[PDB]
């Protein structure tokens, strides 16, 4: 196991966990939680950042001295990926943009970059690769985002046969784009949503890293309760004490949440999914200046 990688300590800040993890897209909403969960337990995190060094500054106190190493990269080049994942044994893929840019479309973000990452990871000898796709990802879907996810998920599994795919279902959190999106508005009764908490997704990724038998498996990370869109927005506006993103976001948010009973979930990794009723107040206490919504099961 290459002695330098043997775990040591009591699982603390200055301990060693034997995890050399390269977290692509660590500067996002999910990336900060993933990096924090990795670094609070003694693992080394390599972070590749396209953006200014100032943006990443928040991550600095997430690990002990020398445990977090920042390097620059770009998806268009393979040498940068090779030098970033050269020494890692775990590669986590969190790259993803919800919209379109003049240099990166959904095909660039969700297909080419993950495929190149998986190919380089396989070439370099990375033991484990974890990929993030969507719960609603299928080739036939009208939305480009979901359609792109399906093509990418397939091509990654082709490149890295023993990769682990995680399909979170509409993550919500303190910096999320769901509850913030509906609380900033200040069409429904047919769309049902299945949100999942951000801490649960991060712990699921960590457990999938620590779980040996989850090599080729695929997971669907879903919350405890299913909510209609209308009464969920009603609850969101009630918590904020309020009276009651171009084209792809609306078409994706009016799309109902799929159900995949065959795929293993968070409970198979040992995570009790946290109900949205506990964390809604935590997220929405800042939008201010109780009667939870009914759930369908």
């Amino acid at each position: 196991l290459h002695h330098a990688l043997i775990p040591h300590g009591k699982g603390g800040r200055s301990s060693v966990s034997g995890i050399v993890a390269t977290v692509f897209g660590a500067t996002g909403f999910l990336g900060r939680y993933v990096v924090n969960h990795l670094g609070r337990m003694g693992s080394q995190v390599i972070v590749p950042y396209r953006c200014e060094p100032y943006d990443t500054m928040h991550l600095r106190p997430m690990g002990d001295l020398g445990q977090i190493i920042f390097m620059e990269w770009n998806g268009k080049d393979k040498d940068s990926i090779r030098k970033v994942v050269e020494h890692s044994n775990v590669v986590i893929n969190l790259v993803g943009r919800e919209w379109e840019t003049k240099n990166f479309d959904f095909e660039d973000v969700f297909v080419k970059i993950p495929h190149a990452i998986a190919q380089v990871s396989k070439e370099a000898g990375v033991e484990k690769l974890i990929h993030i796709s969507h719960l609603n990802a299928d080739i036939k879907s009208p939305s480009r985002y979901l359609r792109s996810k399906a093509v990418g998920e397939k091509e990654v599994r082709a490149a890295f046969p023993e990769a682990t795919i995680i399909k979170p279902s509409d993550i919500f959190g303190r910096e999320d784009r769901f509850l913030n999106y509906f609380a900033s508005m200040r069409l429904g009764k047919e769309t049902v949503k299945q949100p999942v908490y951000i801490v649960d997704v991060s712990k699921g990724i960590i457990n999938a890293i620590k779980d040996p038998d989850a090599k080729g498996k695929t997971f669907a990370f879903v919350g405890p309760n299913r909510y209609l869109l209308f009464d969920l927005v009603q609850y969101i506006f009630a918590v904020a004490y309020r009276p009651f993103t171009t084209r792809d976001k609306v078409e994706r948010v009016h799309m109902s949440d799929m159900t995949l009973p065959h795929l293993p979930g968070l409970e198979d990794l040992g995570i009790q999914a946290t109900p949205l009723e506990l964390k809604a107040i935590e997220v929405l206490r800042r939008h201010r200046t109780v009667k939870p919504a009914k759930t369908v099961n």
Partner: protein, 115 residues
Amino acid sequence: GTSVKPIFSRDMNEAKRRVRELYRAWYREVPNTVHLFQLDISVKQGRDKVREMFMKNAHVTDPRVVDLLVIKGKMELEETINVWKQRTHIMRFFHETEAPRPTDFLSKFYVGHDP
């Protein structure tokens, strides 16, 4: 013999009385503490935590020790009443950032040498 000097009580009955009075005050305070410090826990959780803290010291069989713990708990209560603490001090009672340390022998054996 073994004569010792009292702090507040003469026997264990008065110590129990003081413990009950302190528990009364803490139970009264939990709702105002949760509301004022803007905790994300429920008043049920805070009161259960108070119960757990009081239960930690249930095996004490010495009035001097018991009313010394009562004095300490009263100091803590006065800290919480006057808002001398912050959210961080109050939140610590819950260890929400610490990984669950396992108890079974097999799990401990795998992680390391610490018994």
